[PDB]
Enzyme design. Structure first.
Site, mmCIF file in Angstrom:
data_model
loop_
_atom_site.group_PDB
_atom_site.id
_atom_site.type_symbol
_atom_site.label_atom_id
_atom_site.label_comp_id
_atom_site.label_asym_id
_atom_site.label_seq_id
_atom_site.Cartn_x
_atom_site.Cartn_y
_atom_site.Cartn_z
ATOM 1 C CG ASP A 83 -1.980 1.169 1.104
ATOM 2 O OD1 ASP A 83 -2.121 1.749 0.003
ATOM 3 O OD2 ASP A 83 -2.665 1.446 2.129
ATOM 4 C CG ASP A 93 -3.501 4.242 -2.646
ATOM 5 O OD1 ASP A 93 -2.705 3.324 -2.311
ATOM 6 O OD2 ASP A 93 -4.602 4.415 -2.111
#
Ligand SMILES: CC(C)Oc1cc(CN2CC[C@@]3(C[C@@H]2C)CN(C)S(=O)(=O)N3c2cccc(F)c2)ccc1O
Ligand SMILES: [Zn+2]
Ligand SMILES: [Zn+2]
Length: 394
Positions: free
Chosen positions: A34, A224
Site C-alpha cells: 500500500d 496509490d
C-alpha cells in the site's frame, strides 16, 4: 532483483500482496502493498476473513510498545497494539529488520473475504503514520538498518467461481530494467506524506478537458497501489465521463455502468475496444514548464469480471470513479506502467510496462517532454485546520 520478480499476487480488485515473515521463529503472512498509507499492521486476533494471524506470544523477539493505535477511514477501520519485531520479505532483500508492527485486534470492513492477505505494508511517509509521525514506517526502518537503497519500484500486472489472479513485482532497493521498455520519466514528489504528485493537463482521445489544472489536484493527487480505481475529483470525473460517453455513444449503457455498479457485456471476444478513448494524464516534469504524459487504454479502465450466469460473454466494470479527496492513481493507472518510487530523489518514475495489456492498434504510453509558457501552479493548498497547525514538529 531476479529473485523479487513475481513476488506479488492477489485477486482482481482485491489488491496486490507480498509474502512477509514476522517474529522469531518467522510467522508467514501475506501483506497488502500500500503506497497509500504508512503503517505496517497485521491481523493479530481471529477474524472470519483471516485464515491465520500474527501470534505475538509465539515470537521470542517481540517487544510490546504498551500503546494502542486507532485507525479509522471512510470505508473501514482497524485498532491494534503497537510493538516491534523482526520482519522480513522472503522474496525481497536478503535482510531482516526490526520494525514497528501494529497488531490488529479489532477491525471493521478492513480485511476482504478471499483476498488471501492478512496485513498491510504502508509504504508512504511518516507524516501520515498513525498515531503520529514518530512511528517510523517499515521502509524507513529498512533503509536505516541495512544498506538497502532508498527506492522501490512496482510492476503491477494484468488479471467462474473465483476472481482472476493477478501477478506483479515489488523491487526493493532498485530498478529492474527487464520490467520496462522505453524511457523512465520522472514527476516530482510534491510533499512527502502520501506519494503526492501534480497533474498539469488531462486529455481524453487527444482532446483537452479544458479545466483549470488546480481542479486535477483538488485536494491532492496521489499514486496509490492500495486503490483499484482511477479516482477523480467530482468536476474532473463529470468531465471525463461526458467525454467517454461522447466517444462510445454508439453504445447506450445504463447509469449503473458509469457509477461502476453494473457490468456491460459483449459476445465473447467482440469487445469494441476502438469506441473507447485513451486517457492521457500529463504529469509535472523535473524541469520547470516541462511535463510528460502517461496514456492509459480502455483495457486498463474497463476491468474484466467473469459472469457465472453469462460465461459466453466478456463483461466489464467501469473502473474510474468519483472522489471527494482528490485524484487517486490506483491499479487502473499502475498496471500500464513500471512505477519507480524514488524516495532518495523525491520523484516518481513512470515507464511503459513489459507486462501491460494492449491491442494491435494502441498501446499504453509514457511520452515527453511537453511544454507550457507562463504556466500557473496546479497544486492545491489544503485549508489549514487549527488542530493541524497546533502540532509541534520536534
Ligand atoms: C484492496 C482494496 C480493495 O481494499 C483495501 C485497501 C486498503 C488500502 N487503502 C485503500 C484506501 C483507503 C485506505 C486504505 C489503507 C483510503 N480511502 C479513503 S478508503 O476507501 O476509506 N480506504 C479503505 C478502503 C477499504 C478499507 C479501509 F479500511 C480503508 C486497505 C484495506 C482494504 O480492504
Ligand atoms: Zn514543542
Ligand atoms: Zn513530532
Amino acid at each position: 532483483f531476479v529473485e523479487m520478480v513475481d513476488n506479488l499476487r492477489g485477486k482482481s480488485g482485491q489488491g496486490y500482496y507480498v509474502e512477509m515473515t514476522v517474529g522469531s521463529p518467522p510467522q508467514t503472512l501475506n501483506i497488502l502493498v500500500d503506497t497509500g498509507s504508512s503503517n505496517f499492521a497485521v491481523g493479530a486476533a481471529p477474524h472470519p476473513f483471516l485464515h491465520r494471524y500474527y501470534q505475538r506470544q509465539l515470537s521470542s523477539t517481540y517487544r510490546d510498545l504498551r500503546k494502542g493505535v486507532y485507525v479509522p477511514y471512510t470505508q473501514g477501520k482497524w485498532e491494534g497494539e503497537l510493538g516491534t519485531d523482526l520482519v522480513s520479505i522472503p522474496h525481497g532483500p536478503n535482510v531482516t529488520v526490526r520494525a514497528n508492527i501494529a497488531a490488529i485486534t479489532e477491525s471493521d470492513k478492513f480485511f476482504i473475504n478471499g483476498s488471501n492477505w492478512e496485513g498491510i505494508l504502508g509504504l508512504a511517509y511518516a507524516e501520515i503514520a498513525r498515531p503520529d509521525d514518530s512511528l517510523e514506517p517499515f521502509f524507513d526502518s529498512l533503509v536505516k538498518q541495512t544498506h538497502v537503497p532508498n527506492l522501490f519500484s512496482l510492476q503491477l500486472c494484468g488479471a467462474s467461481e473465483v476472481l482472476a489472479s493477478v501477478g506483479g513485482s515489488m523491487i526493493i532497493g532498485g530498478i529492474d530494467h527487464s520490467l520496462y521498455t522505453g524511457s523512465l520519466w520522472y514527476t516530482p514528489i510534491r510533499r512527502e506524506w502520501y506519494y503526492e504528485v501534480i497533474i498539469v493537463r488531462v486529455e481524453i482521445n487527444g482532446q483537452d478537458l479544458k479545466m483549470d489544472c488546480k481542479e486535477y489536484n483538488y485536494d491532492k493527487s496521489i499514486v496509490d497501489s492500495g486503490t483499484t480505481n482511477l479516482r477523480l475529483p467530482k468536476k474532473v470525473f463529470e468531465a471525463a465521463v461526458k467525454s467517454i460517453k461522447a466517444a462510445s455513444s454508439t453504445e447506450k449503457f445504463p447509469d449503473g455502468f458509469w457509477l461502476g455498479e453494473q457490468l456491460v457485456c459483449w459476445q465473447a471476444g467482440t469487445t469494441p475496444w476502438n469506441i473507447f478513448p485513451v486517457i492521457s494524464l500529463y504529469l509535472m516534469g523535473e524541469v520547470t514548464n516541462q511535463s510528460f504524459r502517461i496514456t492509459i487504454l480502455p483495457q486498463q479502465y474497463l476491468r474484466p469480471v467473469e459472469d457465472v450466469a453469462t460465461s459466453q460473454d466478456d463483461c466489464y466494470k467501469f473502473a474510474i470513479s468519483q472522489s471527494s479527496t482528490g485524484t487517486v492513481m490506483g491499479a487502473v493507472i499502475m498496471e500500464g506502467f513500471y512505477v519507480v518510487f524514488d524516495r532518495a530523489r523525491k520523484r516518481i518514475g513512470f515507464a511503459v510496462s513489459a507486462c501491460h495489456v494492449h491491442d494491435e492498434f494502441r498501446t499504453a504510453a509514457v511520452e515527453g517532454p511537453f511544454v507550457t509558457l507562463d504556466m500557473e501552479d496546479c497544486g492545491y493548498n489544503i485549508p489549514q485546520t487549527d488542530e493541524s497547525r497546533s502540532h509541534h514538529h520536534h
